[PDB]
Design a protein around this ligand. Sequence first.
Ligand SMILES: Nc1ncnc2c1ncn2[C@@H]1O[C@H](COP(=O)(O)OP(=O)(O)OP(=O)(O)O)[C@@H](O)[C@H]1O
Ligand SMILES: Nc1ncnc2c1ncn2[C@@H]1O[C@H](COP(=O)(O)OP(=O)(O)O)[C@@H](O)[C@H]1O
Ligand SMILES: Nc1ncnc2c1ncn2[C@@H]1O[C@H](COP(=O)(O)OP(=O)(O)O)[C@@H](O)[C@H]1O
Ligand SMILES: [Mg+2]
Lengths: 218, 505, 24
Amino acid sequence: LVLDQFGRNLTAAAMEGKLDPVIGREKEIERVMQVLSRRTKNNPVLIGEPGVGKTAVVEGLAQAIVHGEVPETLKDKQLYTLDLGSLVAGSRYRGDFEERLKKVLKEINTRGDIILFIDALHTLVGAGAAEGAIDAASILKPKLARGELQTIGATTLDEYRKYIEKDAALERRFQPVQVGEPTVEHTIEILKGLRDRYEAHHRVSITDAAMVAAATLA
Amino acid sequence: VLDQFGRNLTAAAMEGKLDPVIGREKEIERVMQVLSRRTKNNPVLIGEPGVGKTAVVEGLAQAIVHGEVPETLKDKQLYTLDLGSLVAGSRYRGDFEERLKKVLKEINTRGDIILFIDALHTLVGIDAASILKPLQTIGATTLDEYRKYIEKDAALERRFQPVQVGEPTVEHTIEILKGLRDRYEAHHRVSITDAAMVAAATLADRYINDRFLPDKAIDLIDEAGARMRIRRMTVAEVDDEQIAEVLGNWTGIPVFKTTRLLRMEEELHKRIIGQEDAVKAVSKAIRRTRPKRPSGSFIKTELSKALANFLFGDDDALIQIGQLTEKVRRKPFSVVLFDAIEKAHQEIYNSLLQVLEDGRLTDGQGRTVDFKNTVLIFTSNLLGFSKMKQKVNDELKKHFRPEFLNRIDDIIVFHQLTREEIIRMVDLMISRVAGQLKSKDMALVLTDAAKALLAKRGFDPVLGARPLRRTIQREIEDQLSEKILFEEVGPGQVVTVDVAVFTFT
Amino acid sequence: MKVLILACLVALALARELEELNVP
Ligand SMILES: Nc1ncnc2c1ncn2[C@@H]1O[C@H](COP(=O)(O)OP(=O)(O)OP(=O)(O)O)[C@@H](O)[C@H]1O
Ligand SMILES: Nc1ncnc2c1ncn2[C@@H]1O[C@H](COP(=O)(O)OP(=O)(O)O)[C@@H](O)[C@H]1O
Ligand SMILES: Nc1ncnc2c1ncn2[C@@H]1O[C@H](COP(=O)(O)OP(=O)(O)O)[C@@H](O)[C@H]1O
Ligand SMILES: [Mg+2]
């Protein structure tokens, strides 16, 4: 469809087992689901230092949808990581970018079961802005108003203020979700949940001593 | 034309589309005073991000449609103007300039338009600046951006009058929540108790310190009502228990959310060992608060640490000293420790002096830092023939004037070192290295003789007990590091330091 | 007794020329 030629369906990737197990981080997957159901400031932007698992929270949200562990208002939603690169690519003509983004947003309103995920939401400023063309930020800023566009974002703490914050319009709509760096004890439980992925790729065995050592020595 | 750009706030106030602004009648009155003027008749709502400054204009538009507006402002259609939409369209470049001019040509075609600009600094750094020359406009910036963009233009200050929208008190934002109760009750179909709002105002000020009063508290009410709608899908009464569950996910702290907590005295001494009477002396002094002056004022370093842990949660809530501005703006619930005040001259008596009288420091940085929930602590002290017991407090009275020592909460004394107290410090510092040996499957037991030797060496009361950390590692750990490498001691071994020279198995 | 006031040079440069994306 229109969303597969731009976005990556994370919900379909979670059905096929292509997303890593996101153990822990549950209190913030369900917190993203709280923010998506709010009156205003209903767009959760996952802020956190690079590496703490901001993409993994939404990848853990996709795994929660396919397991039926979400509320019925977010049941069988399709998360799409809309990359701006596939949206700019092509577009060797006029409006090509605004109509490829209008067809994305029309497809979100038509099916109505899409939670858009914009990873690197700071990169929304200046996407497809061509000569005599409006970027992807100016196209959506409006849609956010109508609330016809619940998006999930994921920036760093630096690039949240450096951009998303400033926009005052976005402020009353985007809600910064703190994606904290986990503790060592939380990280060991992440590594235990990720044994079977890294023990199968390398066909090795990873002892419990190694994962406690991996999170402590790191 | 304004019919397709920006929201008509006056039309939204007629339909009840705007959220009701309960409170703020003084600031809305101030904005009506500026708009009624001849010169500088354009308010700039200086606030903090999420302070309620858009609600003043939302409350202004509700005051227009009620007829509670002056005769120079009767039936003024108040428009916010959506920037980033007068873009929406490319014919081709210069579009946002050419389209903004068509909007302004409709404003002076009519006469009842007042623009609201939620980010006035973004049009400073057609620009409208020119059309401002003679179109009344309400702005809204932060105080950092007022001093950066609006005040730094004399062609933008002969017309832009600053209007302060302050952060509400914990009391004042409750009636904001009670006025906004019916909006968030009806949005989630879940009733919200009054207790929850007293909690969501108190707990949001206490634990959220990058966001501001009105929003923070509304963010807890909106998200707890949203959380209740979720788990009934996996009448239901958002309570104060619900707010602490939601704020426990915001901050990520365990739920201990205070007078009961303040009942310490024994709820401590995890890191404080000895010094027992000063701990009992700072109990009744901190609980004098339970004003604009800090929660405690005192004239040890560990004491502070454990005071930062017990009162304010974090061990790193102890600020050891701009140099204290924009780092208590970040955390206004910190114990501010002043290391070695004896070695500083009188230039430091303006950020510890006027804060016991105001609690606020206006400065050149651009924000007024809040000292009303800190614990200020000063760290001052560490002839012939004859035949501290209780007195150290007269030293600092003679050092600097007691014209604010009756403004200091309590000047407490510290008692002398005990031989048993230092032995209780030796087995405390052996825990730092016994855990490093249990990672090797080793066990480090000691004897009373060996613990008394380390107490006997390096304890000097001129230097407090600093020399003890060296004495542990020069004598135990330098000789324990070698025996691991000599492999006299391997894994699965009990190490018993006895006996003078230290020897073991 | 004397103090030297140094002089913290700031990095100040002219605005960047941009390269355009063509839409035919
Ligand atoms: N809770 C978790 N459980 C399992 N794996 C996790 C968890 N959090 C993070 N990870 C893993 O950590 C790695 C980095 O996470 P991720 O890429 O989501 O971080 P990020 O903060 O989004 O990074 P960036 O800022 O570079 O986009 C990935 O392998 C991811 O699967
Ligand atoms: N006095 C008030 N009465 C009612 N709601 C208020 C009041 N002050 C703030 N709010 C609410 O709190 C939030 C603050 O948003 P806004 O006023 O736009 O913030 P800012 O002034 O920082 O831009 C909104 O939900 C607003 O309706
Ligand atoms: N009750 C205590 N009083 C003082 N120092 C203590 C106490 N308990 C442990 N110590 C240790 O003694 C040293 C005190 O030195 P310092 O950190 O300068 O604080 P102070 O001398 O003001 O207590 C630290 O190593 C600290 O961990
Ligand atoms: Mg990522």
